[PDB]
Amino acid sequence: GLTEEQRMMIRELMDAQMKTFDTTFSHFKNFRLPGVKWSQVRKDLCSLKVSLQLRGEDGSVWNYKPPADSGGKEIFSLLPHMADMSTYMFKGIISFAKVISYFRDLPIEDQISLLKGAAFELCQLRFNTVFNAETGTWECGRLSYCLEDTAGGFQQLLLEPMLKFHYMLKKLQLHEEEYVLMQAISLFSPDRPGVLQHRVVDQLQEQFAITLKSYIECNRPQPAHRFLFLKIMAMLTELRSINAQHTQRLLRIQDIHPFATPLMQELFGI
């Protein structure tokens, strides 16, 4: 069963999550929208391809259909918007960490090093909870990002790490407690650049993992949930690779077509 220390741990995790994760994205507004050579590889924005939907509080609906790669500059049409969403999410994640005792007790320099290391991963973890695997769309309140699984794209073309990651993780049908424990394990990674107290962070991480493992063996006895803990841990390892791949993808785009916000520049060292 779960000890008092583990139960207390999950509770502060859950508490921090409900206080800082605006599941309906109610407070996300004033964001930009798409206007009404090295560039070769810089064609990474083609792995995205998502239509956007904005449901007005009055019953109205705005829908955006992205352009097709042609000529050159037009695939950058969705970057400003996506930058505004990323920043909004990042703020939620920063608030998440600062409200966690185990994180506050760490030295200020290490908090920064941990956040710059895990910010992306925690966002993805949060995005997975509003992801609908049936329709292939991230439901963010009045806003929706539906995958272009439709004129040419194929539902089996999950060769994109990001997407495959979301489908697989969603397939595990985790509980809220499991998702927050995953965020704790990712945030408290001793192997992040610039970390000082690598020993503290490492013990903390091990404790979060042990709590997740115990939480699993105490609340999921069905054969379907066997090796669940190991599958989750394997997912986090995948999320780490993807994270590095995305950072590099981001830096290349940022090098030719600046779009990162101040908060994004801080996190990526720009």
Q: Which residues pair with 158 in a beta bridge?
A: none
**205: annotated binding-site residue?**
no
**124: annotated binding-site residue?**
yes
Contact 17, 47 (CB under 8 A): no
3-state secondary structure the chain: CCCHHHHHHHHHHHHHHHHHCCCCCCCCCCCCCCCCCHHHCCHHHHCCCEEEEEECCCCCEEEECCCCCCCCCCCCCCHHHHHHHHHHHHHHHHHHHHCCHHHHCCCHHHHHHHHHHHHHHHHHHHHHCCEECCCCEEEECCEEEEECCCCCCCCCCCCCHHHHHHHHHHHCCCCHHHHHHHHHHHHCCCCCCCCCCHHHHHHHHHHHHHHHHHHHHHHCCCHHHCCHHHHHHHHHHHHHHHHHHHHHHHHHHHHHCCCCCHHHHHHCCC
Contacts of 112 (CB under 8 A, 6+ apart): 194
**246: annotated binding-site residue?**
yes
Domain boundaries, position 118 = 1-270
Experimental method: X-ray
**Long-range pairs for 108-112 at CB < 8 Å and ≥24 separation?**
109/194, 109/196, 110/194, 110/195, 110/196, 110/197, 110/201, 112/194
**127: annotated binding-site residue?**
yes
How many domains, the chain?
1
Contact 264, 86 (CB under 8 A): yes
Contact 166, 131 (CB under 8 A): yes
Q: Which two tokens stand for residue 105?
A: 């007790």
Q: Which two tokens stand for residue 238?
A: 């995948």
**126: annotated binding-site residue?**
yes
Q: Which residues of 165-193 are buried (b: 16+ CB within 10 A; e: fewer)?
A: bbebbeeeebeebbbbbbbbbbbbbbebe
Q: What is the CATH number of the domain that holds 202?
A: 1.10.565.10
φ, ψ (nearest 5 deg) of residue 177: -60, -40
* Other CB atoms within 10 A of residue 130 CB: 18
Sheet holding 143-147, edge to edge: 61-64, 50-55, 143-147, 137-140, 131-132
- How far is C-alpha 64 from the chain's CA centre? 23
CB-based burial label for 128 (10 Å; 0-12, 13-18, 19+): buried
CB-based burial label for 142 (10 Å; 0-12, 13-18, 19+): middle
